[PDB]
Design a binder for this molecule. Sequence first.
Ligand SMILES: Nc1ncnc2c1ncn2[C@@H]1O[C@H](COP(=O)(O)O)[C@@H](OP(=O)(O)O)[C@H]1O
Ligand SMILES: Nc1ncnc2c1ncn2[C@@H]1O[C@H](COP(=O)(O)O)[C@@H](OP(=O)(O)O)[C@H]1O
Ligand SMILES: C[C@]12CC[C@@H](O)C[C@@H]1CC[C@@H]1[C@@H]2CC[C@]2(C)C(=O)CC[C@@H]12
Ligand SMILES: C[C@]12CC[C@@H](O)C[C@@H]1CC[C@@H]1[C@@H]2CC[C@]2(C)C(=O)CC[C@@H]12
Ligand SMILES: [Ca+2]
Ligand SMILES: [Ca+2]
Lengths: 343, 343
Amino acid sequence: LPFPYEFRELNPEEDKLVKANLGAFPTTYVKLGPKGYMVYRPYLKDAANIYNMPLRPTDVFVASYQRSGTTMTQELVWLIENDLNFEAAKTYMSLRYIYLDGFMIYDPEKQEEYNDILPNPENLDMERYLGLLEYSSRPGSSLLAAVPPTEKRFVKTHLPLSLMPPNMLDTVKMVYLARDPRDVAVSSFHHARLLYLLNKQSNFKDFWEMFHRGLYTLTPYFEHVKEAWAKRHDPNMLFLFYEDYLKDLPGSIARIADFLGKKLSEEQIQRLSEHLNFEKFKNNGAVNMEDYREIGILADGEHFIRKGKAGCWRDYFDEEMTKQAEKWIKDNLKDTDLRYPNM
Amino acid sequence: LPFPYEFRELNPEEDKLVKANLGAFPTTYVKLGPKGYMVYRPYLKDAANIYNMPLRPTDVFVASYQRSGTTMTQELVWLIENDLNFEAAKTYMSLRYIYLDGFMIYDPEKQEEYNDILPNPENLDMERYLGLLEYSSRPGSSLLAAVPPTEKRFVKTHLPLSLMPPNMLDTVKMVYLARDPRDVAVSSFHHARLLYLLNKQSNFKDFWEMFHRGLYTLTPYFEHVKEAWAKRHDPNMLFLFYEDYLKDLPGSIARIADFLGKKLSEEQIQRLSEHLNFEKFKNNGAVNMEDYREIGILADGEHFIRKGKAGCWRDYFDEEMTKQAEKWIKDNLKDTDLRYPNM
Ligand SMILES: Nc1ncnc2c1ncn2[C@@H]1O[C@H](COP(=O)(O)O)[C@@H](OP(=O)(O)O)[C@H]1O
Ligand SMILES: Nc1ncnc2c1ncn2[C@@H]1O[C@H](COP(=O)(O)O)[C@@H](OP(=O)(O)O)[C@H]1O
Ligand SMILES: C[C@]12CC[C@@H](O)C[C@@H]1CC[C@@H]1[C@@H]2CC[C@]2(C)C(=O)CC[C@@H]12
Ligand SMILES: C[C@]12CC[C@@H](O)C[C@@H]1CC[C@@H]1[C@@H]2CC[C@]2(C)C(=O)CC[C@@H]12
Ligand SMILES: [Ca+2]
Ligand SMILES: [Ca+2]
């Protein structure tokens, strides 16, 4: 099966906005497909392979537009499939899951350019840093095909459904997370600050400008959610809202367990929910990627697991931005049954 | 005289490293003085008293950074002062010497927490175990003041000179032992394993990391040795190298005897050297503290008197560690006349 998509460069206006906020970061973008999904240029080298990647009936995918509850979901899905063996789950999440599209953010051609975004390149633990860069050079497809058949493959991706094998849900199970885009925006802003992707001179309004305009990584945001929403009633797709994890963690866990063919005891569900307690999780070395800070690539006062709250976007949007966001959500939810819990 | 030192908590980075290797052990550390000597928290309660402890012209101290030849030296110094009465030396070394700072490793506040580091707490001889804990609760100063004036006091300590009465050498005699830090590191690692101080999951590279970085008990290592080295000329200080005990035991014994005001016969020196034979000493119940194993607090395959060799650090350091250790020693020996025999 051939790759049915053409890519396109950003036009002058789009390129101006993006550069003004992300120009310092080495990697550039291109829009892919008819919906114009923003992908880091390096994604193109593995695009056809991903679209045609061989799937296995045992594969399990945790998909979502970034910062929507992926990490939490991965931990839950992993423990449940592995009979709540919390002990075995103490290994790095990055070793337990393959980040299908994680590679695209790195361009080997510009290797020398990446350390220049760091306040102090000199403090880097080079062995580990170069180690990271090498891993990031490996296309997702290869990482997946590498896993032996007698080992259950856990996949993490932020890729929209239209870029992966169509009908994939006929073979694999997927848990897709969606979150209020406004909160997603604030979390993505900080995430961007965490890894030095955003220009230090840019602020949140700038980021929000790129975001709702479909000029940030893997956006248009709504097209992304919509594809998954449409596959909501499929037996192998479990569409969940990040907000529900907060309002009723126990309840979400039951749904995930059932979706995976497991019946947990009220006690087991309780044990899992406690394990997912924000403070405890935020301090869980296996999932917070704090070891990245010892390597030297994380910014001061930023963490992968941040605040873990819903609705905090009100502390970042001014009157104008607020209305602009309302109109935007309004327009994209018009003539669809998609609705957010907290909205 | 007031205690001229302030203490300081470990900063986040330092605390992370330490905890990762010693966290399971109940007792915590703090850095003391301008040099930042690592002391177990409980040391603070008796710090001022030790700094101001009353000394006696008959007192004799055997000092050193741990695992540098203290025990051997204690036996030699004791026999020589007691007219080679080998018979009277058959009593426990712990009863013949007061371990000035031995107490700091135990915190009565966490009494319940200590037995939890044992594989089998249930096998403990409780009477003796609680007996140990009680003795360990007594500050060193008190143990010393307790000894009657008509009895010669033998003191053992791993405290640097700057923490004891300044000018102390004006009253007491001290024999200070120094050993190649690399070998000291390997011996301290095993010692740490012996008493269950180190996390069972940590390995030697981890320990060596803490060690040369000044994050282990009574380090910075070089500052410790340097203080004693500077007083090497004083008539009441005898600076010796552990390595010399191996290359020329008879020769070291003569120096110790002369330092103490005793003239031994070539035969007496010979009798002493034989008494200090590694195998024989390692099996000497009065100094190997094997009775601690019957109590139940020693780890399998670990002993106080281990290999008794010099240079064996080469079997524990990999190429990188080796260079890192070379640079480190290089830097601390720069602009000083301090030199190690085997180096
Ligand atoms: N155990 C947990 N409970 C609640 N929120 C959690 C969590 N672990 C992570 N999060 C939150 O999930 C978001 C990250 O999403 P993802 O894992 O998909 O990248 C962050 O949102 P915030 O930035 O709002 O804090 C993060 O703090
Ligand atoms: N009679 C003896 N001859 C040689 N080395 C001895 C000895 N008695 C003890 N040692 C060694 O001295 C070190 C202990 O030092 P200290 O008494 O100051 O704590 C240990 O080093 P190793 O771990 O290298 O074997 C130990 O085996
Ligand atoms: C590219 C970048 C961020 C830019 C540069 O510092 C190199 C690193 C290499 C590791 C990457 C990281 C981005 C976030 C990634 C993709 C992860 O979440 C795991 C691997 C991480
Ligand atoms: C604290 C600890 C080790 C931790 C715990 O098992 C209690 C014992 C009590 C006796 C201590 C021992 C450490 C080493 C000591 C200080 C000696 O060398 C003699 C007394 C010993
Ligand atoms: Ca560079
Ligand atoms: Ca206990």
